[PDB]
């Protein structure tokens, strides 16, 4: 409808795939080459389905910060015959707060979904399903089941992926440029 949705659509149309594990279907953001991200609670194994194709997982790494605390991001390298558009230059370098964000989701259940979630707070510490977690972003939108892996954007920046909510508020793990230095 406007410039927020335009930037979000540009990311969804070229840099997402539908990932399916034993724990369900997730929006998965492709970042560069064959490297993508997914919430750690997706429990990625040796095999994953990508747009319903059986795919070997070449590597998977559940990130923690230097305090040894969960970040709820898993970086996955996919045995795929095709590279993602490199979007590392849209990633923020530091932890920050943001105005006017969009959460975008694409699964079987919720195709072509775009939610204007508004202002984003650097929340920091969250007990997320009983796991201490750092680098959490918070938005005052009642997000639901099926939205995990959703991409959080502003005009010009890809800032996080949706990892849960409490019924009133939604929560995303930060994406930083330093996670994807090759």
Q: Give the start-to-end residue ranges of the domains of the chain.
A: 1-15+85-182, 16-84
Expt. technique: X-ray
**How far is 92 from 134, CA to CA, in rounded Å?**
16
**How far is 9 from 104, CA to CA, in rounded Å?**
8
**How far is 134 from 157, CA to CA, in rounded Å?**
20
Q: Is 177 an annotated catalytic residue?
A: no
Contact at 8 Å (CB) between 101 and 120?
A: yes
Q: Is 25 an annotated catalytic residue?
A: no
Give me the resolution in angstroms, 1 decimal. 1.7
**How far is 130 from 151, CA to CA, in rounded Å?**
23
Instruction: Count CB atoms within 10 A of the CB of residue 80.
Output: 18
Exactly one of 41, 106, 134, 162 is catalytic; name it.
41
Tally of residues, the chain: 182
**DSSP run (H or E) holding 6:** helix 3-15
Pairing relationship of beta strands 151-154 and 47-50 according to DSSP bridges:
unpaired
Exactly one of 25, 106, 148, 162 is catalytic; name it.
148
Exactly one of 72, 106, 134, 162 is catalytic; name it.
72
Q: Is 72 an annotated catalytic residue?
A: yes
């Amino acid at each position: 409808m406007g410039p927020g949705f335009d930037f979000a659509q540009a990311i969804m149309k070229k840099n997402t795939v539908i990932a399916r594990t034993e724990k369900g279907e997730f929006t998965m953001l492709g970042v560069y080459d064959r490297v993508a991200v997914i919430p750690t609670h997706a429990s990625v194994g040796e095999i994953i389905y990508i747009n319903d194709v059986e795919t070997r997982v070449l590597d998977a790494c559940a990130l923690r910060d230097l305090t040894d605390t969960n970040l709820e991001i898993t970086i996955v390298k996919l045995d795929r015959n095709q590279k993602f558009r490199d979007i590392r230059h849209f990633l923020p370098r530091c932890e920050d707060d943001y105005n006017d964000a969009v959460l975008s989701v694409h699964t079987s259940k919720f195709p072509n979904m775009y939610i204007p979630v508004g202002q984003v707070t650097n929340y920091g510490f969250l007990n997320l399903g009983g796991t201490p977690t750092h680098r959490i972003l918070m938005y005052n939108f009642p997000t639901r089941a099926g939205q995990c892996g959703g991409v959080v954007t502003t005009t010009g920046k890809v800032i996080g992926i949706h990892v849960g909510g409490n019924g009133a508020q939604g929560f995303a793990a930060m994406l930083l440029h330093s996670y994807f230095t090759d």
